[PDB]
Structure formats: structure tokens, C-alpha cells
Amino acid sequence: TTAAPLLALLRENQDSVKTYALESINNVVDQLWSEISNELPDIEALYDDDTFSDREMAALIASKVYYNLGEYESAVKYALAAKDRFDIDEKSQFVETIVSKSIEMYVQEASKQYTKDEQFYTKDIIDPKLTSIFERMIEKCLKASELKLALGIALEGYRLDIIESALKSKLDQSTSENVKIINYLLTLAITTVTNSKFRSSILRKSFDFLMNMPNCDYLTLNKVVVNLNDAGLALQLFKKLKEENDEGLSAQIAFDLVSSASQQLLEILVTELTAQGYDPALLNILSGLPTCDYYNTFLLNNKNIDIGLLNKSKSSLDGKFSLFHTAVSVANGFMHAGTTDNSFIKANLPWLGKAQNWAKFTATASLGVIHKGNLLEGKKVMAPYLPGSRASSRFIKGGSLYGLGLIYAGFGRDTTDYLKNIIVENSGTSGDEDVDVLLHGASLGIGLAAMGSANIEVYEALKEVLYNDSATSGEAAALGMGLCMLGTGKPEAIHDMFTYSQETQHGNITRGLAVGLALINYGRQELADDLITKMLASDESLLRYGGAFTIALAYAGTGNNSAVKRLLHVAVSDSNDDVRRAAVIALGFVLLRDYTTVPRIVQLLSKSHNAHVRCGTAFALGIACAGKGLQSAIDVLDPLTKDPVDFVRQAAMIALSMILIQQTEKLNPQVADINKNFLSVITNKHQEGLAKFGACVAQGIMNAGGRNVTIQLENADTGTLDTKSVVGLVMFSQFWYWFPLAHFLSLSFTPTTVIGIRGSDQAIPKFQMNCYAKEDAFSYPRMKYSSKPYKVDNMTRILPQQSRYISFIKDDRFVPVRKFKGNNGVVVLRDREPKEPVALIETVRQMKD
Amino acid sequence: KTIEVTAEINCFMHLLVQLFLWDSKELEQLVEFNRKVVIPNLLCYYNLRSLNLINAKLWFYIYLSHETLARSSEEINSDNQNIILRSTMMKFLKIASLKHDNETKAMLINLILRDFLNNGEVDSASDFISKLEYPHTDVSSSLEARYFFYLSKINAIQLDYSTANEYIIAAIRKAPHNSKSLGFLQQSNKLHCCIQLLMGDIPELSFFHQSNMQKSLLPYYHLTKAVKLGDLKKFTSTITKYKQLLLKDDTYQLCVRLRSNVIKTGIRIISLTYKKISLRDICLKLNLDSEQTVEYMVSRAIRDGVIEAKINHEDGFIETTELLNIYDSEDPQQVFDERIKFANQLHDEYLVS
Amino acid sequence: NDKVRFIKDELRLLQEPGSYVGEVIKIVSDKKVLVKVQPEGKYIVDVAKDI
Amino acid sequence: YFKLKKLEKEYELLTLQEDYIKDEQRHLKRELKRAQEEV
Structure with missing residues (x-):
């Protein structure tokens, strides 16, 4: 009682x-x-006595x-401090729950205590009695x-x-x-x-365990060197392949390393491979000559561009401004990308006469997307349109240097030095409108071309195109400085550009320099926090428009x-309408x-x-949800297609097409009604310029590269983040703000290709791997797993999603070592029985390599 | 096997429902098996959980009859059985930690306060009551009402009437069941009349008149009248007659608390309105009660604050106030302030709702 | 959100220079209508594309 | 446990968003008065 x-x-x-009594x-x-x-006070007084020995019991x-x-916190101290009254080795409701709390206490603290000192666990800072209970939890x-x-x-x-001890011991x-x-743990x-400091330490130490080698995943070995950009991890990576040299291992790695890595690292790694003693094999893989040949291959065989559709579109009206021409030029280039197909231009040369200055620049440049893929006849086509050889028009002439930069971007090396001279040359004088547009094309083209690789000569040149303050050229130049100096920028570029934005006045310049300033800040995070504060603190609309993107890029990937x-705050409360749009777009990328x-x-x-x-x-929803499904997402964009305002209709149509490329064609029942609607608008002439603009470019994205190639961000064909892609969509968001910005969508069309592959050196096998698959090379736009034979399983249209259900069989000369890669942008089954039965149909890459 | 786990559980609930005197023959003999049934594959699973698939109420019904001590028969130094129950209920009490536990947890506290109300000591109540708060949005309208009823009982010994009045009035405005309109309703009414007596403000039992037995009412009237007319003599003889009643209900505590109140109520009816009230009248009234402590009791009377007066006995007058307020400062504003707070909480519910 | 919009719709709707009440004299098959307008003249006018 | 991290993440995104609802709601109040005044 x-x-x-x-x-x-x-x-x-x-x-x-x-x-x-106790x-x-x-x-x-x-x-x-x-x-x-x-x-309790009485009991507590026994505890505090160090003469009375049943203190622990009290x-x-x-x-x-x-x-x-x-x-709970107070009792947890008091049990430790008793010096035997913390015993986890019994099982109780008391014991289980206070242990739950104890871990919570150490973890919360551990966040704070790491930030001060990264040796705390090593030391007395979090008291031994706590650290023991935690260490026992581990055991x-x-x-x-x-x-x-x-x-x-x-x-x-x-x-x-x-x-470390957990991974080590159990191997x-x-x-x-x-x-x-x-x-x-790596993912x-x-x-x-989000802490850098922790994450690096784990990634280098885990690399070593995989590097020992009995079962290790190459994709993962590659990922952790790419992210952290450390020379030492690369040196060891390459040194391992010398020792354990197999054509299979060596291709797999180089094929990863050519997609995932960025240019400036790529170069720094090659420099080391030469200095260590090199394999001539890797240096060819890293060219990206193979990947561009694959793309060409795919598009040639798998075609279904539907030029009857484009023909259908153009011919419905020529009304609704010169904007209408800009659209069908852009839809041409997307459809015919890397397939090589000039159909719009062949027909309509009167159409060119209709078109405005800026539409004529898009039209030349649209040829830049078409002949992208050929890095040999890409320059060649543009030759009759160069200076020293003139052109039909100066408006064409400008679009020529923009189309070339599209084609050769990230391998512009020679052409860049060439293009730099035109730039430095017309800063001295050339206020005629024809020479400005020339100076414009060179500036656009060269920023694409030197993108991803520091050239202070590039920064310097362009800054003087800015000092002329051309509304035309300044835009180009400005992006060009951001595009080149991609990475972590410099303290210099940040302060010098930002001050200069208030000092000089133009609208076109303000928009160009803001996006310029954002671009240099990639992967920075807290180091970029300083320029974010300054831009949002400017009360200029242009700079605040640019301010979002800076966050977007700096934090690109890491949620x-x-x-x-910070983007939600700017977005709601500012009066300026433009800033709200830019800022919701910016949410998607984080x-x-x-x-x-x-x-x-x-x-x-x-x-x-x-x-x-x-x-x-x-656009926000579209960007973020591009690389995967999201049916619920498609349900939102539905109202927005028919939204009363013309520019909201436009944007929903475009947005919808970037996600559902070969998820279209009655996979979702609704998508037929959307495709039909795209047609209805164009055919109607009671629909406005922006609405029909919207229907026309959305038609190009869906039907891009003959219905085979796809709009990704957070890729499923390469599987890692791409610089080209984030940046590319940011140019893409503006297209009425300044008209020839579309072409950067070129940079992130990805092949869906399902091809034979060899671990050994290429020769083009093509064979079906017959595993059970859904209908989505049978559901494409129009003119499961069970482990059974299936109708087509090599090439076709397919889907990135479906490719993963078709996996490389062990029942030929082609051997699995991955149960299929999981990616489908570069193939790879490992060939263990070279130059044997299992197909043989040389590609065009084997006619010169 | 999924089916097996589920099948045990449905069976355990079913046995608990049946055993309220159907296919049954001794609630106490069967208790052992009911404890047996409860703890594996049921009580065990729920560790961070609460439900109305687990219900203390079923076990309460069972346990309550044994605590008439007619199966114990008072042959023993303490009940084992209640200690066992209490041990087990307190064991749940640990598991609850105010994260999602307010449901079944609240019943256990009703049970714990009941054992104190039967014969324990009600100073332990304070902690349970406090522990037991956490937002309540999963307790049933009858459960709220019973808890309040028990809580009110606690308050009264602790000499906290106002708090108890609010709770008992809030209780009877829950429970659309026609099964808590029966004897439970009578018990609830009993307690609301007792609280009315204690404050000594006591209105007539009019409202009670068509909702209780006329047998209950007349004695109940008798007590109220004793206070109201303000006689000690009338009051004592009413206690003497209805002795069995006050004992039976166990509201025998009234006899201590009320006596001091009754004598005060008796002075109060005799007017205190004007600037002096002659000492001889007030002395006269008191003289009947006790004429050896006429100064001591009037002084005490003033001290209490029930009424308030000034005395000179070198003038031999008792000086008094009207006992009627003023509106000219913060104290009516404080009533304004309480009302607006009440409205806002209510507003928040309507919006939520 | 709806409320904000409702008030706004009224503010737009109430801005108008007013429309004239008139009477169709007779229907014309080139998609013109003849209307004798009450306070104005008589005009032959172009019917709505959607009427 | 790899599952628990993931689930905590999903919930967190959700949290930021619950505050976010409130902040648009406050803003709307200001704009409602100004519009009603305008009429």
C-alpha cells in the first residue's frame, strides 16, 4: 500500500x-x-557525499x-555520474528509452562540436562516460x-x-x-x-576500400574523385589500372570519366596520367569522339523526324509577327538534330525575307544544332558564311559564329584563339549595326566554346566589349565571362562586375551581367553567400533576377x-513581377x-x-522533374495549357514536352489530347503569337532528334549532374527577353540508345538481349518484367526507364559484370571473347579509327 | 500467419467483450486468464502506440466489482490484487511519455484517482494530473466527463471549490449516451449540489427536480434549506436524520466544512448595508450559536473575507460596507479580458473545424 | 486567394464606355446585320465571328 | 535506417513548405485591403 x-x-x-532504506x-x-x-533533495544529498558509498544507489x-x-536529460547525466548506474546490458523499458534519448543528446551536440573542432570524439570534449555508452551502441x-x-x-x-572500423572489419x-x-553510405x-568538411573525409577513405578490388563498382569509384576534384585520388586511380590492366576495366572507367568529369579537371587529370607514364588508350576515350559518333549512328538508323508535321506547322499562317518564323526555325533545328536534315531552309528562302534580323540569326544557328555531332563537317558547313568569304547577309553572318560555337563547344580549342581576335578587333571601332551583330556572334560562340575552363584572356577581352556599352554585344560578352570562369570564380570578378553594373546604364547589359555573375558561382554554397546578399540588397530588378540563379547554381545538386x-522570401514579397518568375524557376535546381x-x-x-x-x-516543375516521372505533376500543368493569358499557355506546352519524350503516345491516355492540342493551335489563326509560338517549339522538343533523344536534368543516361544542363535551361528561360538563347538546349539532348557494347575496343555489335519489357518503342508520338522473349530489345525508340529492364545476357560472347549498367547513354556489356560470333556491323567510327 | 496474429487479437478482444456476465460464472476466477490474454501478442506490440483497440474500460469493468472487498472479505493485511493492478497500470504509465499517449493513458489516471478516492490519500494526485496534460484530441466525450468528475472530487478535499464547479458543469455537457443518463447521472448531480453547498451561494434544486428520484430530492432539499435559512440547529438535526444517506454516498466530509459556513451564512442574511450596524443585533444572532466566542467568531468572520467589517468595542458598534462593487478601474476590465480569451480559443476551433 | 480575384474582376468589369441598345431590322447572309440603334443612327455592322 | 534518413528528408521538405503557406497568406492580406480600397 x-x-x-x-x-x-x-x-x-x-x-x-x-x-x-535505499x-x-x-x-x-x-x-x-x-x-x-x-x-528527491534528500536522496540527492547522499549522492553529493563522497564519504558515503551508497551514493550510486541514491x-x-x-x-x-x-x-x-x-x-530525461537530467537522469542521463546522473546515471553516468553514479559510475555504475548506466548499464545497457540489461533490457528494460527504462534502459531502452534513455539510451534512445542519449544518442539524440550526442548527435545534436555532435553537429555543434564538429563545427568547432573535428577531433572532438578523439578527445575529452564530450566526456568519456557518454562516449562509452555511444561506443557500446555501435558494438x-x-x-x-x-x-x-x-x-x-x-x-x-x-x-x-x-x-572506417564498420566497413573494414566485416569484409x-x-x-x-x-x-x-x-x-x-556513399550516395x-x-x-x-551538407557539410563539406565531413563528406570529403568519408569519400577518400571509402575509395581505398573499393581500390583494394575484390568486387568494386566502377561508377562509384569514379563519382567520388569527380565531385571533390582531387589530384591525388586520380593519380592512385590511374596507377591501379596499370597494375590490373584489362581492356574491359580500362574502358569502363574512361567511359565513366568522359561523361561525369568537367573539362578543367579532365585536363588536370591527363597532365598527371602523362607524367605518371600513360596508356594511349584512355586518351582516345576522353576525346568524346566516340560519344558523338554513337549519337549520329543512333539517329541515322532510328529516324522518325516527321517533316510532314513541320511542313504542316509553318504553312498554317506566316502572321503573328516575326516571332512566328523564330519558332519554326527552332523547331526545325530540334527535330533534325544530329540527323542532318535542312528541310525548312531548302523550301523557304522567301521565308528568310519575312524574318527579322534576330530570326535570321536563329535560322543560321539552327544549322549549328543540325550539324552538331560532326566535329569535322560542323566547321565545314559554316565555311561559306565566315568572314574572308562573306555571306548573303550580315544578319546570317553573325549567326554563323554562334552556330559554330554550338557545334564545337568544349572542344573549341583552336577556333577560340581565332574568334578572340575578331572581338579585340571591333572593340577599337565598329559602331555600325552590321559589325555589332558580327561582334555579337563571336562573343556568344566563344563563351560556349571556352566554357568550363579558366581563361583570363577570355575574361579580359570580353570586359572591353562591355566598356563600349553595345546593347547588342554586351549581352554576349557578359554571358561569355560567366561561362568561361565557371567554377568558384575569383574575388576579383565578383567585386569588379557588381560595382560596374550600377555604374553603366542599359537594360540588356543589366540582364546579361547579372546572369554573368551568377554563373561563376557553382558548387560554392556558403562561399557564394556574400554575392547573394549584395544582389538581393540591390534594389535593381535585373540584379535580383540574377540573384536567384546564384543560389541555384552555388547549391546546384545538394538540397x-x-x-x-532565401528564394521563397524574395519571391513572395517583392512587388516586381519579373523577380517572382525567375525565383520559382530557381527552386527547382536545388x-x-x-x-x-x-x-x-x-x-x-x-x-x-x-x-x-x-x-x-x-518551367520550375518541368526542370526539376525532367529526369523521371511524376504523373501528379502533369496533372498541374493541365490547367496552365489553357490558362487565359497567352504566355502562360506557351510555357505549359514547352514544359510538358521536356518530361514526357517517349512517355508520350498513349502511355498516359491524356497525352494524345495534349499532342492534338499542339496541332489545333497552329492550325488556328485566332490563337495569338505567343500561344502558337508555344505550341510550335513544344512540338520540336517532343519530336527532338527523330523522337529518340531526350530532355534530362538529374540524368538517367549518365546518372550524375551536368554543368551543361543546369546552365542550358537558364539560357532557355529567356527567349523573348533576348531572342537567340534557345540553342543552349542543344547541350543536353541525350541518346536513349540500347546497343550491343564491348568491353574491348568497338566494332559495333547489335543484337537483342530478349528480356521482357513494356510498350514504349511501340508508344511514341505519331505521324513490365517477367523474363520472356520480347519483340525488339536492340535499338528502336525505347525509353531510358525501359532500357533498365533489358539486360545483357551471358549466353553469347558478351558477358555481364553489372547485371546491366543502369545507364543507357553510352552502353557497355563486357566482351570476354573478342572477334567472335555475336554480330558484326561496323559503324562510321570504324572507317577512320 | 498474418492471419494468425490478427486472429489471436480479434479473439482476445472478443473474450473481453463477452465476459460481462455472458457465458461466464465468476469474474474473479477468470481475472487470471484475462491478465494472461492481455499481455502477450497485444500489450507487448504496442510500445509506442495507443488505440481504441486497447481499452482499460473493459478491464475497469471487471476490476471494479472486486473492490467491494467481499471476495477479499478483510481476512488480509492488504489486497494483493489491487497492488497487482496498480503495478501493471503504472507499468503502462512508463511506456507513455506524452508523444501520442493521451488516449488510453487518461483512463489509467481515472483508475488511479479512484483508488485514492475509495481509501487512499489524494496528495499523490497532483503529479499525475499535471503529467497527464498534452493536447487532448483523442479522448471520448464520456471519458472526458468521468475524468472531470474524479478531478472535481480531488479538488474539494484540497479546498478548491471554484475549480471543481467549472469542471462538473463542463462534465455534464459531454455524453449523449443514454447509458450515462442512468445511475452515473445521479452521482454527478450529487456532486454539483455538494459544491453549491460549500460555496454557500446555493440556489434552489429546481433544475434537478425532473432529473432525479423524488426520494433523492427531498433529503437533498433538506440539506440545502439547512444552509439557506442559516440555522445550526436545523442543520445538525438534518445531519442526524439523513445519516445513512451522507454515509452511504461517502460525502460525510460536508459535516466538517459546512458547519463554519452555515454559521457565517446565518450572519450574512442579517443586513450589513449601512455605515454602522448596531452591535446588539449582530451579538443577538450570534448568541444563539455560541455566546462565549461572539468577538472571536466575528473577528474570524471578517478575516476570512466572506464578508468584511470593522469593529470598535470602545464604541460598541460594528461598521460595515454595502458589499456592492464599483466599475471605475481594472477589475471589470479583467472580466472583459477573460471573455475575449475564451472567444479566441473558441474561434481557433471553429476555423480549425 | 479567390476573394482577391473577385474584387479585381469587378474593378475591370466596371470600366467600360457603355454599349448601345439597338434593334435588328434584318439579317444579312454575308454575316452582316442591319441594326437601327435607338439613340444613334442606322448602321450595317459586322456580326461577331462566334455569333 | 537508410530508409529512416530518407523519410526524415521527405518530411523536412514538407516542413519548410508548411511555413511557406503562412507567408503567402500574410501577403494576401495586404493586397486584399489595397484592392478593396481601389474599387
Whole structure:
């Protein structure tokens, strides 16, 4: 009934009687805690005595009662401090719950304590009694032989020694299962931690374990060197392949390394490979000559451009301004991309006479997308349109140098020095409007061409095109400085451009220099936080429009709540309409990897009173959700297609087409009604210039490269982030703000190709791998898994999503080593029985290589 | 096997429903098996969970009859059985930690306060009551009402009437069940009349008149009248007659609290309106009650704050106030302030709702 | 959000220079209509494309 | 546990968004008065 006999002895005199009282109380503390709660100061006084030795028992009793009160933190101290009253080795409701809390305490702290000092766990800073309970939790976990728990608690609690020991110890080098655990932490450590400092340490140390080699995944080995850009990891990577040289291993790696890595690293790695002693094999793979040949191959065989459709479009009206010509020029170039097909231009040369100056520049340049892929006849076609050979028009002449830069971008090396001279040359004089447009094309083209690689000579040149303040050329120049100096910028470029934006006056310049300033900040994060503050603090619309993108780019990939919050604040409260649109677009890029969250964010914001918000959101949702499904997403854009304002209709149509390329054609029943609608608008002449503009370019994206090639961001054909892609869409968002900006969509058309592959050197095998597959080379626009034969399984249209269900068989000369790669942009099955039966049909790459 | 787990559970609930005297033959004999049934593959699963698939109420119904001590028969130093129940309920109490536990958790506290109300000591109540707060949005209208009823009972010994009045009035405005209109309704009414007596403001039992037995009412009227007319003599003889009643209900505590109140109520009806009230009248009234403590009691009377007066006995007059307020400062504004707070909480619910 | 919009629709709607009440004299098959307008003259006018 | 991290992430995005609703709501209040005044 009462605890009163016991409690009476707890206050009675003599140490012995108090020792007995503690142990009498002990047995039933839990049930009677309420009464015993009043006696806590008395119990606490025994605890504080260091002469009385049943202090530990008094503490234990205190803890139980505090737990029942809600003071979990206080009891956790008190059990440790007792020096035996923390025992996890018993199993209880008390014990389980306060252990749950203890980990929470260490983890919270561990966030703070890492930031001050990254050796804290190594040291007395978080007290040994706590650190022991945590270390025992690790051991507890490991015993259960489920590694994801052990690694979890330690990741949150910033202990590197535990992440290493966990991977090390358990290795059977089953062997696959340890490797799986390694790959799960890797994806995780980048996408869930935002701290640089932690993430690098894990990534280099895990590289070593994979580098030992008995079962290791090449894609993952490659990823961690790309992100961190460290020369030492690359040196070891290459040094390993010398020792364990196989044509198979060596291709796989180089083929990864040519997609994922950026140019300036690419170069720095090659420099090291030569200095270490080199393989001539890798240097050919890194050319990207193979990938451009593959693309050509694909498009030639798999065609279905539907020029009857484009013919259909153009001919419905020639009204609705010179904008109407700009659209069908742009839809031509997308349809015919890398297939080589001039159909619009052959027919209409009167059409060119209709077209304005700026439309004529898009039309020349559209040929730049068409002959992209050939890096030999790409220059060749543009030759009759160069200076020293003149042109038909100066308006053509300008678009020629923009089309060449499209073709040769990221391998512009020679042409760049050439183009630089035209630039430095017409800064001295050339205020005639024909020479400005010439100076314009050179400036656009060269920024594309030197993109991703520092050239201070490029920065310097262009800055003087800016000092002329041409409304025409300044735009070009400005992007060109951002495009080149991509990376981490310099302190210099930031302060010099930003001051200069207030000093000089033009609208076109202000828009160009803002986007210019954003571009240099990629992967920066907190180091970019300083220029973000300055731009948002400018009360100029142009700079604030640019300000969003800076966050977008700096944080590009890594989801950050702080970064997105800054864009939400600018977006809602500013009066200026333009800034709202730019800023919703900007949300998508941070949130690229949390693409499930986008349908909830833009569920609200498609219902707005300002049209600018609605247009920007069709694009926002579209960008982020491009690389994968999202049917719910397609349901939002539905109202926006028929939204009362013309520019909201435009933007929904364009947006819709970038996601559903070969998910179209009755996969989703609705998509037929959307495709039909695209047709209806064009055929109608009671639809406005921007609405029909919107229908016409959206037709080009869907039907891009003969219905075979796709709009990605957060790729499923290369599987990693691409610089080309984020930047490319940002140019894309402006196309009425300045007209020839479309062509940067060129930079991120990706092949869906399903081809035979060899681990060994190429010769073009083509064979079906017959695994069961859905209908989506049978559902494309118009003129499951079960493990059975299927109708077509090599080439066709297919889908990136479907390609993963068709996996390379062991039943020929082609051997799996990956159970299919998971990507489908460069192929690769490993060929273990070279120059044998299993097809043989040489491509055009084997006519010169 | 999915089916097996589920099938055990549905069976355990079913046995708990049946055993309220159908296919049954001794609630106590069967208790062992009911404890047995409860703990594996049921009580065990739920560790961070609460539901109305788990229900203390079923077990409450069972346990309550045993606590008439007619199966114990008072042959023993303490019940084992109640200690076992209490041990087990307190074991749940640990598991609850105010994260999602307010549901079943609240019933356990009703049970714990009941054992204190039968014969324990009600100073332990304070913590449970506090612990037990956390936003309540999963407790049923009858459950809210019973908890309040028990809570009110706690308050009254602790000498906190106003708090108890608010709770009992809030209780009877829950529960559309026609099964808590029966004897439970009577118990609730009993307590609302007792609280009315204690404050001594006490209105007539008019409202109660078509919602209680005329047998209950007349004694109930008798008590109220004793206070109202303000006689000690009338009051004592009413206690003497309806002794069995006050004992039976266990609201025998009234006899202590009310006596001091009754004598004060008796001075109050005799007017205190004008600037002096002659000492002889007030002395006269008091003289009947006790004429050895006429100064001591009037002084005490003033001290309490029930009424307030000034005395000179070197003038031999008792000086008094009207007992009627003023509106000219913050105290009516405080009533304005309470009302607006009440409205806002209510507003928040309508919007939410 | 709807409320903001409702008020706005009224603000636009109420800005108008007013439309004239008139009477169709007779229908013309070139998609013109003859209307004798009450306070104005008589005009032959171009019917709506959608009427 | 790789699952728990993932689920915590999904919820977090959601949280930022629940605050976000509130901030657009505040803004709308200002614009509602100005419009009604205008008429």
C-alpha cells in the first residue's frame, strides 16, 4: 500500500539504516515514484557525499523518478555520474528509452562540436562516460550484423573512426553485401550531409576500400574523385589500372570519366596520367569522339523526324509577327538534330525575307544544332558564311559564329584563339549595326566554346566589349565571362562586375551581367553567400533576377533548406513581377534531388493572380522533374495549357514536352489530347503569337532528334549532374527577353540508345538481349518484367526507364559484370571473347579509327 | 500467419467483450486468464502506440466489482490484487511519455484517482494530473466527463471549490449516451449540489427536480434549506436524520466544512448595508450559536473575507460596507479580458473545424 | 486567394464606355446585320465571328 | 535506417513548405485591403 515505512528509514539516523532504506525503496521505485519524488533533495544529498558509498544507489533511484517526471536529460547525466548506474546490458523499458534519448543528446551536440573542432570524439570534449555508452551502441549494432544501423548513429554523431572500423572489419573479400553497404553510405553521405568538411573525409577513405578490388563498382569509384576534384585520388586511380590492366576495366572507367568529369579537371587529370607514364588508350576515350559518333549512328538508323508535321506547322499562317518564323526555325533545328536534315531552309528562302534580323540569326544557328555531332563537317558547313568569304547577309553572318560555337563547344580549342581576335578587333571601332551583330556572334560562340575552363584572356577581352556599352554585344560578352570562369570564380570578378553594373546604364547589359555573375558561382554554397546578399540588397530588378540563379547554381545538386528559403522570401514579397518568375524557376535546381517535394510546392503557386508566377512554375516543375516521372505533376500543368493569358499557355506546352519524350503516345491516355492540342493551335489563326509560338517549339522538343533523344536534368543516361544542363535551361528561360538563347538546349539532348557494347575496343555489335519489357518503342508520338522473349530489345525508340529492364545476357560472347549498367547513354556489356560470333556491323567510327 | 496474429487479437478482444456476465460464472476466477490474454501478442506490440483497440474500460469493468472487498472479505493485511493492478497500470504509465499517449493513458489516471478516492490519500494526485496534460484530441466525450468528475472530487478535499464547479458543469455537457443518463447521472448531480453547498451561494434544486428520484430530492432539499435559512440547529438535526444517506454516498466530509459556513451564512442574511450596524443585533444572532466566542467568531468572520467589517468595542458598534462593487478601474476590465480569451480559443476551433 | 480575384474582376468589369441598345431590322447572309440603334443612327455592322 | 534518413528528408521538405503557406497568406492580406480600397 504505502511507501511510508521505507521513507521513514531514509530520514532516520545512522548510515546503515539509510543503506538498507535505499535498497528497500529500490525494489518498487517505479510504481510509487510519485511519493518518492518529494524526497528527491534528500536522496540527492547522499549522492553529493563522497564519504558515503551508497551514493550510486541514491542516484539510481533519482534517475527513475526524473524519467517518470519528463526530465530525461537530467537522469542521463546522473546515471553516468553514479559510475555504475548506466548499464545497457540489461533490457528494460527504462534502459531502452534513455539510451534512445542519449544518442539524440550526442548527435545534436555532435553537429555543434564538429563545427568547432573535428577531433572532438578523439578527445575529452564530450566526456568519456557518454562516449562509452555511444561506443557500446555501435558494438550492440554490429553484433546484429546489420551495418546500416551502426553507420547511421556514427554519421549523425560525427565519428569517422566508427565509419572506417564498420566497413573494414566485416569484409569477406558475403563479399557483395559489404560492397552494397559501401555504396549506400556513399550516395547518402553526399545527399543528406551538407557539410563539406565531413563528406570529403568519408569519400577518400571509402575509395581505398573499393581500390583494394575484390568486387568494386566502377561508377562509384569514379563519382567520388569527380565531385571533390582531387589530384591525388586520380593519380592512385590511374596507377591501379596499370597494375590490373584489362581492356574491359580500362574502358569502363574512361567511359565513366568522359561523361561525369568537367573539362578543367579532365585536363588536370591527363597532365598527371602523362607524367605518371600513360596508356594511349584512355586518351582516345576522353576525346568524346566516340560519344558523338554513337549519337549520329543512333539517329541515322532510328529516324522518325516527321517533316510532314513541320511542313504542316509553318504553312498554317506566316502572321503573328516575326516571332512566328523564330519558332519554326527552332523547331526545325530540334527535330533534325544530329540527323542532318535542312528541310525548312531548302523550301523557304522567301521565308528568310519575312524574318527579322534576330530570326535570321536563329535560322543560321539552327544549322549549328543540325550539324552538331560532326566535329569535322560542323566547321565545314559554316565555311561559306565566315568572314574572308562573306555571306548573303550580315544578319546570317553573325549567326554563323554562334552556330559554330554550338557545334564545337568544349572542344573549341583552336577556333577560340581565332574568334578572340575578331572581338579585340571591333572593340577599337565598329559602331555600325552590321559589325555589332558580327561582334555579337563571336562573343556568344566563344563563351560556349571556352566554357568550363579558366581563361583570363577570355575574361579580359570580353570586359572591353562591355566598356563600349553595345546593347547588342554586351549581352554576349557578359554571358561569355560567366561561362568561361565557371567554377568558384575569383574575388576579383565578383567585386569588379557588381560595382560596374550600377555604374553603366542599359537594360540588356543589366540582364546579361547579372546572369554573368551568377554563373561563376557553382558548387560554392556558403562561399557564394556574400554575392547573394549584395544582389538581393540591390534594389535593381535585373540584379535580383540574377540573384536567384546564384543560389541555384552555388547549391546546384545538394538540397539545402536555407538556400530555398532565401528564394521563397524574395519571391513572395517583392512587388516586381519579373523577380517572382525567375525565383520559382530557381527552386527547382536545388530541389532536383528532392523531386517528390516539387508537386506539393507548386500546387499552391499555379493558383496566383500574377501570370508571371504561373509561367515560371510550369518551367520550375518541368526542370526539376525532367529526369523521371511524376504523373501528379502533369496533372498541374493541365490547367496552365489553357490558362487565359497567352504566355502562360506557351510555357505549359514547352514544359510538358521536356518530361514526357517517349512517355508520350498513349502511355498516359491524356497525352494524345495534349499532342492534338499542339496541332489545333497552329492550325488556328485566332490563337495569338505567343500561344502558337508555344505550341510550335513544344512540338520540336517532343519530336527532338527523330523522337529518340531526350530532355534530362538529374540524368538517367549518365546518372550524375551536368554543368551543361543546369546552365542550358537558364539560357532557355529567356527567349523573348533576348531572342537567340534557345540553342543552349542543344547541350543536353541525350541518346536513349540500347546497343550491343564491348568491353574491348568497338566494332559495333547489335543484337537483342530478349528480356521482357513494356510498350514504349511501340508508344511514341505519331505521324513490365517477367523474363520472356520480347519483340525488339536492340535499338528502336525505347525509353531510358525501359532500357533498365533489358539486360545483357551471358549466353553469347558478351558477358555481364553489372547485371546491366543502369545507364543507357553510352552502353557497355563486357566482351570476354573478342572477334567472335555475336554480330558484326561496323559503324562510321570504324572507317577512320 | 498474418492471419494468425490478427486472429489471436480479434479473439482476445472478443473474450473481453463477452465476459460481462455472458457465458461466464465468476469474474474473479477468470481475472487470471484475462491478465494472461492481455499481455502477450497485444500489450507487448504496442510500445509506442495507443488505440481504441486497447481499452482499460473493459478491464475497469471487471476490476471494479472486486473492490467491494467481499471476495477479499478483510481476512488480509492488504489486497494483493489491487497492488497487482496498480503495478501493471503504472507499468503502462512508463511506456507513455506524452508523444501520442493521451488516449488510453487518461483512463489509467481515472483508475488511479479512484483508488485514492475509495481509501487512499489524494496528495499523490497532483503529479499525475499535471503529467497527464498534452493536447487532448483523442479522448471520448464520456471519458472526458468521468475524468472531470474524479478531478472535481480531488479538488474539494484540497479546498478548491471554484475549480471543481467549472469542471462538473463542463462534465455534464459531454455524453449523449443514454447509458450515462442512468445511475452515473445521479452521482454527478450529487456532486454539483455538494459544491453549491460549500460555496454557500446555493440556489434552489429546481433544475434537478425532473432529473432525479423524488426520494433523492427531498433529503437533498433538506440539506440545502439547512444552509439557506442559516440555522445550526436545523442543520445538525438534518445531519442526524439523513445519516445513512451522507454515509452511504461517502460525502460525510460536508459535516466538517459546512458547519463554519452555515454559521457565517446565518450572519450574512442579517443586513450589513449601512455605515454602522448596531452591535446588539449582530451579538443577538450570534448568541444563539455560541455566546462565549461572539468577538472571536466575528473577528474570524471578517478575516476570512466572506464578508468584511470593522469593529470598535470602545464604541460598541460594528461598521460595515454595502458589499456592492464599483466599475471605475481594472477589475471589470479583467472580466472583459477573460471573455475575449475564451472567444479566441473558441474561434481557433471553429476555423480549425 | 479567390476573394482577391473577385474584387479585381469587378474593378475591370466596371470600366467600360457603355454599349448601345439597338434593334435588328434584318439579317444579312454575308454575316452582316442591319441594326437601327435607338439613340444613334442606322448602321450595317459586322456580326461577331462566334455569333 | 537508410530508409529512416530518407523519410526524415521527405518530411523536412514538407516542413519548410508548411511555413511557406503562412507567408503567402500574410501577403494576401495586404493586397486584399489595397484592392478593396481601389474599387
